[PDB]
Amino acid sequence: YLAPGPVTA
Amino acid sequence: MIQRTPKIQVYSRHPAENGKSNFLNCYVSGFHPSDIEVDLLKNGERIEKVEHSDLSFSKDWSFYLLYYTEFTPTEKDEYACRVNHVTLSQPKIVKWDRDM
Amino acid sequence: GSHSMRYFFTSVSRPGRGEPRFIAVGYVDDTQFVRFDSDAASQRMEPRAPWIEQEGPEYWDGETRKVKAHSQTHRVDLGTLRGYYNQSEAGSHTVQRMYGCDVGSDWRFLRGYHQYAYDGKDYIALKEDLRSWTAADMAAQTTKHKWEAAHVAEQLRAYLEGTCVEWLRRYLENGKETLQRTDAPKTHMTHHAVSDHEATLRCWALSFYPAEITLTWQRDGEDQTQDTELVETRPAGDGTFQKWAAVVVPSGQEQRYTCHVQHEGLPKPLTLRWEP
């Protein structure tokens, strides 16, 4: 179960 | 930028017995960047029905992949894995040895 | 024993034309269970183990939306980092991400991790407390500041300590028949006459799961390192692993040497000694 969409660098 | 050459192991899934069906594996690991060309050879020619794993990588970020195909060893047929990568000036061929 | 769930993501820019190539894999322990590949036709998160096929279409819709969100974040990062590092738009670059959680025997949270790399080197990583970041250089330091102002650690922590563990447990229960079976290595020893005066003994460990194993040679009860070779642990292709270790010995002295094998699936380590 993936994490929510990550935050950009 | 930071290039790591592939380690190559060529081996069968199961102990090799002439005339019995088996899987030939070429395991390439420890390389970066990810683009790589891997062929399996029978007596010099590229085998067509070769499958590979999904790209993943290790603790030091280096990539690994498994290539494999179905085969039937015999006394005299040569099998091998040929690999090309930006870190190699020419493709490297690694012969299968039953005992390794 | 202990378990983990981990995801691996790779993106490779294609300056000549189009979007980056993106590949994602998930694992429970050493078992791959899902994949996504931007170049495959489905454009969906796909099962790679039978016990995940259980999951209904909302699972798969959800995972598919999330994984695409990951590929787009990486695509933006490839552009941002090329500018932070002052690189030309001509070359191909790579971003890599890995995160997940471990649980102990008791299936309670043990630890979580989230790490990110650019061109094969550490860029930024979550610290063990899951509240703060490790940046490797001044570009990553800029990313650290952005993620701190945006409270990224909190929300990761909520997932690593909560959601991740909860799903790991559900998968362990659903994939019980394999995921909670350990397969002890099948071992044997081979003998190769190198010359009239030396021989090689090779100790094999086959068809074992999980991948963690130790093979060590001893001579008259003490560890030996000189004149040995140890191959890296390698996948058999059916979900188990293989390894071997070899030692060169004077011919006629084979009985002095012993191979010791340790693995989670073995109550006692095994000892092998030549004379079948």
Residue numbers in the entry:
A (entry chain C): 1 to 9
B (entry chain B): 0 to 99
C (entry chain A): 1 to 276
What did the published study say regarding this structure?
subsequently eluted from HLA-A*0201 molecules on melanoma cells. context of HLA-A*0201, present in 49% of Caucasian individuals. important tumor antigen, targeted by many clinical therapies.
unligated structures of A2-YLE, A2-YLE-3A, and A2-YLE-5A. the A2-YLE-3A structure compared with the A2-YLE structure.
